[PDB]
């Protein structure tokens, strides 16, 4: 038993969102039965949307009654879920699940899809140098980042190289925030200070891979020794 | 993680009378760099255009508005060379620039 | 309309030990039809207890249910790495159906004095209108910690978002960034931005700060 | 107990201010003080003492801040150590002047 889930990956406020949910392998006939959608915003809890039971039996939160429509299809096996008059604050995570009777609620989960409402459009990262300034404090070792900033939906990558295309283990990944309806995120990489006193290398680059375009501007570092 | 300077090159050399011991008599020889940055620097020592391998001690760098650092290096030399005219030159390496400076007994 | 609240939001618990969790509700479920979640980040939500009495299929023994009414409480013998996760007790008698906040377990660890680190805006990214200065914790334990602006003698308000990382796998601590953001006019009117960092094992709080045009 | 060696560098014959060093090696105790004299007048500033390293060994240098001109008028520049209850006096000055 395995549920799989699809929609668009970005709308628009005030429209309307349509997600399928697709499982194969059993059927919605015998009693108890039932699918249920739960989203959950980041750094929130799940929330409850809606449940189907069988014979055409649907449930909806009062909280949101009269603003969510559950509709099922025998023939394709897949639930159909509409959503209208988006608004940014619901952006989350929507999970489909099946009750295998009427104690065992939720035993098989899917996978999900980030469904991302941001009144922007999906343009491409833009990268800033970042320079430290910390003086009078060498300490054991200092630190250099990296601003990706502007990007949507928030999926990305960061892997930090030499001059000389070097491989660096930075694993200093920042969650992303919604600042002024874009995703905003920071990414750092610790270096040895004794690796800075050594090569003429005075840069190295800043790489990331997001599927708008793939810029990769370098921090030039002001060396110490 | 304010201001680059060149190197300054500085060469002491023993008096008339500043060497002792069992014959033959041997000194020292001082090369130091004051206020250079970046820290890192090579000393080296020449003897009439030969390398000098051995014999040489240099002192690791020490901090002495920008940062300024010094460093000492000593050389062994012996009596009978001096007497010979020959010419020591302290070899100074900072960022690619190189900076000799030649002494001699000579006046 | 059943409200479940969960506390402690957050504990500190230790490999091997045993670990409690509170499920509270706003009034008593018929049959007592509680079941519990287990969820990982990055990953989708599992099932581990339904009826808040029965295991189900490839779930270990040794978790534990019990209590009745509007009182329930889940233990587990033989904490593992990998249980340090989140949490959810949710009720199916309600229908429609309600989920609670939900409780996270830490390891415990000593406390480790943070390191604190300002970077100023490049002038490539004023040439946009737009400044961010950044404030960096790294290596601190707890989680709890206080990050105030302060710029001119002034304290910042309503202009912070805050991020903060998850629990390192290896190392156990925790780091977050704090962003400034602010007008382009409104930062050639300021002359030293600093932000305040306030830890447990710091016997005094320690302040960075920078001058402009100097970086 | 050995007494340290005394041993006065001077500026090169052809030229470069500069400075006057006077090393005490392989003495013992670590403690040592060591002071500067000119034409036989105590001094009272333009001389510092560098920190006593480990070359068991000790290393002690002093550096003496002089001028061009006082250097080659024949002046007297003596660097007293004092060790153990003895005094060493070693009196240098430059060969072409
Ligand atoms: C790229 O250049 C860097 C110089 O910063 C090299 O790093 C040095 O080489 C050793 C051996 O790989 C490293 O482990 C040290 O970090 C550096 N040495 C010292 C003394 O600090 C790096 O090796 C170069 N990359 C390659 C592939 O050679």
């Known amino acids: 038993v395995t549920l799989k889930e699809s929609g668009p990956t970005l709308v628009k406020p005030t429209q309307t969102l349509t997600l399928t949910c697709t499982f194969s392998?059993?059927?919605?006939?015998?009693?108890?039965?039932?699918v249920g959608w739960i989203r959950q915003p980041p750094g929130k809890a799940l929330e409850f949307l809606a449940f189907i039971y069988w014979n055409d039996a649907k449930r909806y939160n009062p909280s949101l009654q009269s603003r969510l429509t559950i509709t099922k299809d025998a023939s394709k096996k897949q639930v159909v879920l509409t959503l209208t008059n988006l608004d940014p604050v619901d952006t989350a995570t929507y999970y489909c699940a099946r009750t295998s009777g009427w104690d065992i609620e939720f035993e098989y989960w899917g996978q999900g899809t980030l469904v991302t409402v941001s009144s922007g459009s999906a343009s491409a990262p833009t990268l800033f140098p970042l320079v430290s300034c910390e003086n009078s404090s060498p300490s054991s070792t200092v630190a250099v980042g990296c601003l990706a900033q502007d990007f949507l939906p928030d999926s990305i990558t960061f892997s930090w190289k030499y001059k000389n295309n070097s491989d660096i283990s930075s694993t200093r990944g920042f969650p992303s925030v919604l600042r002024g309806g874009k995703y905003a995120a920071t990414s750092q990489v610790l270096l040895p200070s004794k690796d800075v006193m050594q090569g003429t290398d005075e840069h190295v680059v800043c790489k990331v891979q997001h599927p708008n375009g793939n810029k990769e501007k370098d921090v030039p570092l002001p060396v110490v020794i | 993680g304010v201001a680059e300077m060149n190197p300054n090159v500085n060469v002491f050399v023993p008096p008339r009378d500043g060497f002792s011991g069992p014959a033959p008599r041997k000194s020292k020889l001082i090369c130091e760099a004051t206020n250079f940055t970046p820290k890192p620097i090579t000393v080296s020592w020449l003897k009439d255009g030969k390398l000098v391998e051995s014999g040489f001690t240099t002192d690791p760098v020490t901090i002495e508005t920008p940062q300024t650092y010094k460093v000492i290096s000593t050389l062994t030399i012996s009596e009978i060379d001096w007497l010979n005219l020959n010419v020591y030159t302290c070899r100074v390496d900072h960022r690619g620039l190189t900076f000799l400076k030649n002494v001699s007994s000579t006046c | 309309e059943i409200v479940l609240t969960q506390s402690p939001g957050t504990l500190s618990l230790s490999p091997g030990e045993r670990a409690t969790l509170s499920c509270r509700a706003s009034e008593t479920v018929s049959n007592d039809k509680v079941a519990w979640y287990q969820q990982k980040p990055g990953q989708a939500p599992r099932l581990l207890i339904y009826g808040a009495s029965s295991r189900a299929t490839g779930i270990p023994d040794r978790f534990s249910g019990s209590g009745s009414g509007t009182d329930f409480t889940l233990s587990i013998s033989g904490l593992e790495p990998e249980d340090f996760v989140v949490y959810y007790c949710?009720?199916?008698?309600?229908?429609?159906?309600?989920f609670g906040q939900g409780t996270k377990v830490e390891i415990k660890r000593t406390v480790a004095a943070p390191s604190v680190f300002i970077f100023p805006p490049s002038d490539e990214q004023l040439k946009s209108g737009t400044a961010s200065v950044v404030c960096l914790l790294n290596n601190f334990y707890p989680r709890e910690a206080k990050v105030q602006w302060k710029v001119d003698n002034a304290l910042q308000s309503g202009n912070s978002q805050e991020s903060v990382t998850e629990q390192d796998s290896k190392d156990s601590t925790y780091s977050l960034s704090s962003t400034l953001t602010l007008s382009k006019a409104d930062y050639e009117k300021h002359k030293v931005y600093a932000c305040e960092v306030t830890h447990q094992g710091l016997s005094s709080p320690v302040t960075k700060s920078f001058n402009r045009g100097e970086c | 107990e050995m007494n340290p060696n005394v041993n006065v560098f001077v500026p090169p014959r052809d030229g470069f201010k500069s400075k006057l060093i006077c090393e005490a090696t392989n003495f013992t105790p670590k403690p040592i003080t060591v002071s500067w004299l000119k034409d036989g007048k105590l001094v009272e500033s333009g001389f510092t003492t560098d920190p006593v390293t480990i070359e068991q060994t000790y290393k002690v240098i002093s550096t003496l801040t002089i001028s061009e001109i006082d250097w080659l008028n024949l002046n007297v520049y003596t660097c007293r150590v004092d060790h153990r209850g003895l005094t060493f006096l070693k009196n240098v000055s430059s060969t072409c002047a």
């Open positions: 949710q009720q199916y008698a309600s229908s429609p159906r309600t």
């Open positions: 392998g059993f059927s919605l006939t015998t009693t108890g039965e039932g």
